[PDB]
C-alpha cells in the first residue's frame, strides 16, 4: 500500500501473468490427456509446473508488497521464486540428457531403466530446487543485518554466489551434451540447436554474471534490467518444448 509501486514493477507483474497463463494451459493439456505418460512428457510437465510457479510467484509478490503490506509474505514468496527458477533450470538439463540418451541408446532407452532414471532425475531436480530455495527462509538471510545483502535485498551474498556457481557448472554440462548431439545429427538441424542454446544463454547469463559483479550499493535499475530476460525465458519454454510437439498441437486445435 504505502510503497507506491514503480513503473518497473508493473512490467514484471504483467510478465508474471503471461507466464502463468501460458504454462497453465500447457499443464492442463498434459494432465488432461491420459496418453501423455512417457518420460518425455513427465519432464516437459515438470518444466511447465516450474515456470507456472515462477509466474504465480511474481504476481503474488507484486500483490503482497504494494497491496497487502506484509514483510513475512514477501519473504516467503521470494523463496518460492528462487525454487521455481532453480527447478526450471534443472528441468532443462533433465530434458537435454533424456534427448541425448534417446539419440544414443536407440535400443536400450525403450527398456524399463528409462523410467527409474526419469524418476531419479525428477527427484534430484525437485530436491535441489527445494534445498537451494530453502536459504531465504533459513540461516542465510540478510534481514537481521551484518550479513552483507546481495543484489536482491532479502537474499544473502553467499547464497547468490553459490547459485551462480551451480548455474555455471550446469551450463558447462549443456555445452558438452549439445556437442555430443551435434555429432549424432551431423545444416538445418544444427541451426535449431544453436538457436535453442542461444535462447537459454542470452536469457540467463546477464543475471548470473551481474550477480557476481554487483553489490548492495549498486543502482536498483540493474536488478530489473537483468532479471527481465530471465522472466522472459519462461515464456518461450512452452513454445520450444511443448507447443512444437505434434500430439500436443493435435490436442490444442480442438
Amino acid at each position: 500500500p504505502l510503497p507506491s509501486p514503480k513503473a518497473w514493477d508493473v512490467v514484471l507483474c504483467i510478465s508474471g501473468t503471461l507466464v502463468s497463463c501460458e504454462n497453465a494451459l500447457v499443464v492442463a493439456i498434459i494432465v488432461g490427456t491420459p496418453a501423455f505418460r512417457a518420460p518425455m512428457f513427465l519432464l516437459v510437465g515438470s518444466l511447465a509446473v516450474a515456470d507456472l510457479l515462477a509466474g504465480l510467484g511474481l504476481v503474488l509478490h507484486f500483490a503482497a508488497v504494494f497491496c497487502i503490506g506484509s514483510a513475512e509474505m514477501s519473504l516467503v514468496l521470494v523463496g518460492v521464486l528462487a525454487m521455481a527458477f532453480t527447478a526450471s533450470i534443472g528441468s532443462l538439463l533433465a530434458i537435454t540428457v533424456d534427448r541425448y540418451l534417446s539419440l544414443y541408446n536407440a535400443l536400450t532407452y525403450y527398456s524399463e531403466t528409462t523410467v527409474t532414471r526419469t524418476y531419479v532425475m525428477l527427484a534430484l531436480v525437485w530436491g535441489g530446487a527445494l534445498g537451494l530455495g530453502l536459504l531465504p527462509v533459513l540461516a542465510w538471510n540478510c534481514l537481521d543485518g551484518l550479513t552483507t545483502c546481495g543484489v536482491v535485498y532479502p537474499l544473502s551474498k553467499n547464497h547468490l554466489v553459490v547459485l551462480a556457481i551451480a548455474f555455471f557448472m550446469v551450463f558447462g554440462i549443456m555445452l558438452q551434451l549439445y556437442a555430443q548431439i551435434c555429432r549424432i545429427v551431423c545444416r538445418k538441424g544444427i541451426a535449431t540447436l544453436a538457436v535453442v542454446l542461444g535462447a537459454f544463454a542470452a536469457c540467463w547469463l546477464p543475471f548470473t554474471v551481474y550477480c557476481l559483479l554487483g553489490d548492495a550499493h549498486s543502482p536498483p535499475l540493474y536488478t530489473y534490467l537483468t532479471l527481465l530476460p530471465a522472466t522472459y525465458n519462461s515464456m518461450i519454454n512452452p513454445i520450444i518444448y511443448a507447443f512444437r510437439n505434434q500430439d500436443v498441437q493435435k490436442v490444442l486445435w480442438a
Partner: protein
C-alpha cells in the same frame, strides 16, 4: 551421422532401371516395383512382423503379383522361419539373413523403388535419410523422428502397428506414375541433403 560423400548416386554406373533389372535377375524374379525392408527382427521395436502380416493380407489380392519384396535382417529364429516359409510359398518374395557390406546396401537403396520403415519407435531415423539420399521413396510409421524427416511431399506416413493401413499404403503406392516417382526421388534427395 550421415555421410554425404559416401551415399550418392554418382558411385553407381548404370541407370536406375538397368540396376533394378540386374538385381532382380540376380534374385531370380521378374521386373517390377520392389519393396525392401532392412533391419533387425524382434517383437516391438522394428516391426518386421507388421510387414509380414501386410504381405500375407495382400497375398489374396490380384495385384500382389506385381509386387516384389526383399527382406534383410536377423533375430528371432521363429521370424526367420516365417520369412523363409513366405519366400518358399511365393516366388515374388526373397529373404537375405546374411550381413551385407555398405556398398551392397547403397546399391540396394539405389535399385529398389520403395523402402519400408514400419518401426514402432525411431528417435532419429538414419535409415530414412540414407535411403532418401539415393532416391528411394520411404513408407514409414508416423512416430517421432520419422515424422520430422518425411513430409507429405517426400513419401508416405502410416500409423504404427496397423497392418491394414500399411497394406493400404502399399496398394496406394503401387499406382504412382513414373514422372511422379522421379519428382518424389528429387524431392527426397533435396530433403535428405538439406539436413
Amino acid at each position: 551421422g550421415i555421410d554425404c560423400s559416401f551415399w550418392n548416386e554418382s558411385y553407381l554406373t548404370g541407370s536406375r532401371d538397368e540396376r533394378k533389372k540386374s538385381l532382380l535377375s540376380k534374385f531370380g524374379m521378374d521386373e517390377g516395383v520392389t519393396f525392401m525392408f532392412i533391419g533387425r527382427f524382434d517383437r516391438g521395436q522394428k516391426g518386421v512382423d507388421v510387414l509380414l502380416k501386410a504381405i500375407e493380407i495382400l497375398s489374396s489380392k490380384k495385384e500382389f503379383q506385381e509386387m516384389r519384396f526383399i527382406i534383410i535382417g536377423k533375430g528371432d529364429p521363429e521370424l526367420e522361419g516365417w520369412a523363409r516359409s513366405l519366400e518358399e510359398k511365393h516366388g515374388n518374395v526373397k529373404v537375405i539373413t546374411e550381413m551385407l557390406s555398405r556398398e551392397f546396401v547403397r546399391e540396394l537403396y539405389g535399385s529398389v523403388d520403395f523402402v519400408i520403415i514400419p518401426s514402432y519407435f525411431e528417435p532419429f531415423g538414419l535409415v530414412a535419410l540414407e535411403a532418401m539420399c539415393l532416391g528411394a521413396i520411404p513408407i514409414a510409421s508416423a512416430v517421432g523422428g520419422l515424422r520430422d524427416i518425411i513430409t507429405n511431399e517426400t513419401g508416405i506416413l502410416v500409423k504404427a502397428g496397423d497392418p491394414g493401413e500399411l497394406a493400404n499404403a502399399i496398394l496406394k503406392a503401387l499406382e504412382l506414375s513414373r514422372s511422379d516417382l522421379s519428382k518424389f526421388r528429387e524431392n527426397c534427395k533435396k530433403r535428405a541433403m538439406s539436413f
